[PDB]
mmCIF file of all heavy atoms in Angstrom:
data_model
loop_
_atom_site.group_PDB
_atom_site.id
_atom_site.type_symbol
_atom_site.label_atom_id
_atom_site.label_comp_id
_atom_site.label_asym_id
_atom_site.label_seq_id
_atom_site.Cartn_x
_atom_site.Cartn_y
_atom_site.Cartn_z
ATOM 1 N N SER V 1438 3.014 -1.364 -47.028
ATOM 2 C CA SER V 1438 2.723 -0.572 -48.216
ATOM 3 C C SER V 1438 1.377 -0.935 -48.835
ATOM 4 O O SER V 1438 1.158 -0.686 -50.025
ATOM 5 C CB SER V 1438 3.842 -0.733 -49.247
ATOM 6 O OG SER V 1438 4.990 0.006 -48.871
ATOM 7 N N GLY V 1439 0.472 -1.517 -48.052
ATOM 8 C CA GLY V 1439 -0.828 -1.907 -48.560
ATOM 9 C C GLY V 1439 -1.944 -1.745 -47.549
ATOM 10 O O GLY V 1439 -2.725 -2.676 -47.327
ATOM 11 N N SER V 1440 -2.021 -0.565 -46.930
ATOM 12 C CA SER V 1440 -3.061 -0.228 -45.960
ATOM 13 C C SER V 1440 -3.065 -1.186 -44.775
ATOM 14 O O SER V 1440 -3.749 -2.214 -44.801
ATOM 15 C CB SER V 1440 -4.438 -0.212 -46.632
ATOM 16 O OG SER V 1440 -4.392 0.474 -47.872
ATOM 17 N N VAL V 1441 -2.309 -0.851 -43.727
ATOM 18 C CA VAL V 1441 -2.283 -1.677 -42.527
ATOM 19 C C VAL V 1441 -3.632 -1.591 -41.824
ATOM 20 O O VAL V 1441 -4.245 -0.517 -41.735
ATOM 21 C CB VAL V 1441 -1.128 -1.245 -41.606
ATOM 22 C CG1 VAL V 1441 -1.225 0.239 -41.273
ATOM 23 C CG2 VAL V 1441 -1.100 -2.087 -40.338
ATOM 24 N N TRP V 1442 -4.115 -2.737 -41.330
ATOM 25 C CA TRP V 1442 -5.446 -2.814 -40.752
ATOM 26 C C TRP V 1442 -5.319 -3.101 -39.267
ATOM 27 O O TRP V 1442 -5.221 -2.154 -38.461
ATOM 28 C CB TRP V 1442 -6.287 -3.860 -41.499
ATOM 29 C CG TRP V 1442 -7.689 -3.982 -40.988
ATOM 30 C CD1 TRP V 1442 -8.492 -2.972 -40.544
ATOM 31 C CD2 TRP V 1442 -8.457 -5.186 -40.869
ATOM 32 N NE1 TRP V 1442 -9.711 -3.471 -40.156
ATOM 33 C CE2 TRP V 1442 -9.716 -4.828 -40.345
ATOM 34 C CE3 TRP V 1442 -8.203 -6.531 -41.155
ATOM 35 C CZ2 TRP V 1442 -10.717 -5.766 -40.102
ATOM 36 C CZ3 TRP V 1442 -9.199 -7.461 -40.911
ATOM 37 C CH2 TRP V 1442 -10.439 -7.074 -40.391
ATOM 38 N N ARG V 1443 -5.310 -4.362 -38.842
ATOM 39 C CA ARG V 1443 -5.335 -4.683 -37.424
ATOM 40 C C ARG V 1443 -3.964 -4.454 -36.788
ATOM 41 O O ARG V 1443 -2.967 -4.174 -37.460
ATOM 42 C CB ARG V 1443 -5.778 -6.129 -37.211
ATOM 43 C CG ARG V 1443 -7.280 -6.343 -37.299
ATOM 44 C CD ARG V 1443 -7.629 -7.824 -37.251
ATOM 45 N NE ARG V 1443 -7.364 -8.405 -35.940
ATOM 46 C CZ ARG V 1443 -6.305 -9.152 -35.651
ATOM 47 N NH1 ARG V 1443 -5.385 -9.427 -36.559
ATOM 48 N NH2 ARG V 1443 -6.167 -9.630 -34.419
ATOM 49 N N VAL V 1444 -3.929 -4.581 -35.463
ATOM 50 C CA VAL V 1444 -2.706 -4.424 -34.684
ATOM 51 C C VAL V 1444 -2.885 -5.117 -33.339
ATOM 52 O O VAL V 1444 -3.881 -4.896 -32.641
ATOM 53 C CB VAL V 1444 -2.341 -2.938 -34.506
ATOM 54 C CG1 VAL V 1444 -3.571 -2.123 -34.127
ATOM 55 C CG2 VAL V 1444 -1.244 -2.777 -33.463
ATOM 56 N N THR V 1445 -1.929 -5.967 -32.971
ATOM 57 C CA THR V 1445 -1.994 -6.726 -31.732
ATOM 58 C C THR V 1445 -0.775 -6.419 -30.873
ATOM 59 O O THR V 1445 0.273 -5.997 -31.369
ATOM 60 C CB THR V 1445 -2.081 -8.236 -31.994
ATOM 61 O OG1 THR V 1445 -0.967 -8.649 -32.795
ATOM 62 C CG2 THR V 1445 -3.376 -8.580 -32.714
ATOM 63 N N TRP V 1446 -0.928 -6.641 -29.570
ATOM 64 C CA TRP V 1446 0.135 -6.435 -28.599
ATOM 65 C C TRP V 1446 0.259 -7.671 -27.719
ATOM 66 O O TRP V 1446 -0.642 -8.512 -27.655
ATOM 67 C CB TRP V 1446 -0.122 -5.189 -27.739
ATOM 68 C CG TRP V 1446 0.282 -3.907 -28.399
ATOM 69 C CD1 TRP V 1446 -0.255 -3.361 -29.528
ATOM 70 C CD2 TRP V 1446 1.311 -3.007 -27.969
ATOM 71 N NE1 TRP V 1446 0.376 -2.177 -29.828
ATOM 72 C CE2 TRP V 1446 1.341 -1.938 -28.885
ATOM 73 C CE3 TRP V 1446 2.210 -3.002 -26.898
ATOM 74 C CZ2 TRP V 1446 2.235 -0.875 -28.764
ATOM 75 C CZ3 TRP V 1446 3.096 -1.947 -26.778
ATOM 76 C CH2 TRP V 1446 3.101 -0.898 -27.706
ATOM 77 N N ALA V 1447 1.396 -7.774 -27.032
ATOM 78 C CA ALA V 1447 1.668 -8.902 -26.154
ATOM 79 C C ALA V 1447 2.177 -8.388 -24.815
ATOM 80 O O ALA V 1447 2.532 -7.217 -24.668
ATOM 81 C CB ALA V 1447 2.686 -9.870 -26.774
ATOM 82 N N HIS V 1448 2.208 -9.287 -23.836
ATOM 83 C CA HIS V 1448 2.689 -8.922 -22.514
ATOM 84 C C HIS V 1448 4.215 -8.844 -22.516
ATOM 85 O O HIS V 1448 4.877 -9.612 -23.220
ATOM 86 C CB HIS V 1448 2.221 -9.936 -21.471
ATOM 87 C CG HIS V 1448 0.734 -10.113 -21.425
ATOM 88 N ND1 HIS V 1448 -0.089 -9.303 -20.674
ATOM 89 C CD2 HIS V 1448 -0.074 -11.011 -22.037
ATOM 90 C CE1 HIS V 1448 -1.343 -9.694 -20.825
ATOM 91 N NE2 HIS V 1448 -1.362 -10.727 -21.648
ATOM 92 N N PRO V 1449 4.802 -7.925 -21.742
ATOM 93 C CA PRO V 1449 6.271 -7.844 -21.677
ATOM 94 C C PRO V 1449 6.923 -9.048 -21.018
ATOM 95 O O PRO V 1449 8.150 -9.187 -21.107
ATOM 96 C CB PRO V 1449 6.521 -6.566 -20.861
ATOM 97 C CG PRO V 1449 5.226 -5.810 -20.902
ATOM 98 C CD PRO V 1449 4.155 -6.849 -20.975
ATOM 99 N N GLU V 1450 6.151 -9.917 -20.360
ATOM 100 C CA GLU V 1450 6.729 -11.087 -19.709
ATOM 101 C C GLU V 1450 7.207 -12.132 -20.709
ATOM 102 O O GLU V 1450 8.074 -12.943 -20.368
ATOM 103 C CB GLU V 1450 5.708 -11.712 -18.756
ATOM 104 C CG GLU V 1450 4.950 -10.704 -17.909
ATOM 105 C CD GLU V 1450 3.928 -11.359 -16.999
ATOM 106 O OE1 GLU V 1450 3.710 -12.582 -17.129
ATOM 107 O OE2 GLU V 1450 3.341 -10.649 -16.155
ATOM 108 N N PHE V 1451 6.668 -12.131 -21.926
ATOM 109 C CA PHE V 1451 7.046 -13.102 -22.943
ATOM 110 C C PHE V 1451 7.688 -12.468 -24.169
ATOM 111 O O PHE V 1451 8.000 -13.187 -25.126
ATOM 112 C CB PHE V 1451 5.823 -13.922 -23.377
ATOM 113 C CG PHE V 1451 4.780 -14.065 -22.307
ATOM 114 C CD1 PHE V 1451 3.551 -13.437 -22.429
ATOM 115 C CD2 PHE V 1451 5.025 -14.829 -21.177
ATOM 116 C CE1 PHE V 1451 2.588 -13.567 -21.447
ATOM 117 C CE2 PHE V 1451 4.065 -14.963 -20.190
ATOM 118 C CZ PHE V 1451 2.846 -14.330 -20.326
ATOM 119 N N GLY V 1452 7.896 -11.154 -24.171
ATOM 120 C CA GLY V 1452 8.494 -10.485 -25.309
ATOM 121 C C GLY V 1452 7.602 -9.410 -25.897
ATOM 122 O O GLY V 1452 6.479 -9.691 -26.325
ATOM 123 N N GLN V 1453 8.096 -8.172 -25.926
ATOM 124 C CA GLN V 1453 7.323 -7.057 -26.456
ATOM 125 C C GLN V 1453 7.365 -7.041 -27.979
ATOM 126 O O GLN V 1453 8.216 -6.375 -28.576
ATOM 127 C CB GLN V 1453 7.841 -5.731 -25.894
ATOM 128 C CG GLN V 1453 6.923 -4.545 -26.150
ATOM 129 C CD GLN V 1453 5.486 -4.824 -25.756
ATOM 130 O OE1 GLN V 1453 4.644 -5.124 -26.602
ATOM 131 N NE2 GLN V 1453 5.198 -4.725 -24.463
ATOM 132 N N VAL V 1454 6.452 -7.772 -28.614
ATOM 133 C CA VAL V 1454 6.365 -7.833 -30.065
ATOM 134 C C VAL V 1454 5.025 -7.256 -30.499
ATOM 135 O O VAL V 1454 4.070 -7.179 -29.722
ATOM 136 C CB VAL V 1454 6.538 -9.271 -30.600
ATOM 137 C CG1 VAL V 1454 7.846 -9.867 -30.105
ATOM 138 C CG2 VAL V 1454 5.361 -10.138 -30.184
ATOM 139 N N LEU V 1455 4.966 -6.841 -31.763
ATOM 140 C CA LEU V 1455 3.764 -6.255 -32.342
ATOM 141 C C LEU V 1455 3.488 -6.919 -33.682
ATOM 142 O O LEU V 1455 4.319 -6.849 -34.594
ATOM 143 C CB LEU V 1455 3.913 -4.740 -32.513
ATOM 144 C CG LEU V 1455 3.238 -3.863 -31.458
ATOM 145 C CD1 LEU V 1455 4.042 -3.857 -30.167
ATOM 146 C CD2 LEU V 1455 3.046 -2.448 -31.981
ATOM 147 N N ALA V 1456 2.327 -7.559 -33.799
ATOM 148 C CA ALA V 1456 1.900 -8.220 -35.027
ATOM 149 C C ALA V 1456 0.691 -7.473 -35.573
ATOM 150 O O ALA V 1456 -0.353 -7.405 -34.915
ATOM 151 C CB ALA V 1456 1.573 -9.690 -34.773
ATOM 152 N N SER V 1457 0.831 -6.915 -36.772
ATOM 153 C CA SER V 1457 -0.219 -6.134 -37.406
ATOM 154 C C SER V 1457 -0.671 -6.800 -38.699
ATOM 155 O O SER V 1457 0.090 -7.531 -39.342
ATOM 156 C CB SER V 1457 0.258 -4.707 -37.697
ATOM 157 O OG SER V 1457 1.408 -4.712 -38.524
ATOM 158 N N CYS V 1458 -1.919 -6.541 -39.071
ATOM 159 C CA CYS V 1458 -2.506 -7.065 -40.294
ATOM 160 C C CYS V 1458 -2.609 -5.963 -41.340
ATOM 161 O O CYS V 1458 -2.802 -4.789 -41.013
ATOM 162 C CB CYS V 1458 -3.893 -7.659 -40.030
ATOM 163 S SG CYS V 1458 -3.883 -9.379 -39.480
ATOM 164 N N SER V 1459 -2.476 -6.353 -42.605
ATOM 165 C CA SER V 1459 -2.551 -5.408 -43.709
ATOM 166 C C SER V 1459 -3.193 -6.095 -44.905
ATOM 167 O O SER V 1459 -3.403 -7.310 -44.913
ATOM 168 C CB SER V 1459 -1.166 -4.859 -44.070
ATOM 169 O OG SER V 1459 -1.249 -3.928 -45.134
#
Side-chain angles (χ1 to χ4, degrees):
Chain V
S1438 284
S1440 315
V1441 56
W1442 181 37
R1443 280 173 69 258
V1444 45
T1445 56
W1446 278 64
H1448 304 274
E1450 316 179 353
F1451 332 111
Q1453 192 50 260
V1454 305
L1455 259 76
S1457 58
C1458 274
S1459 181

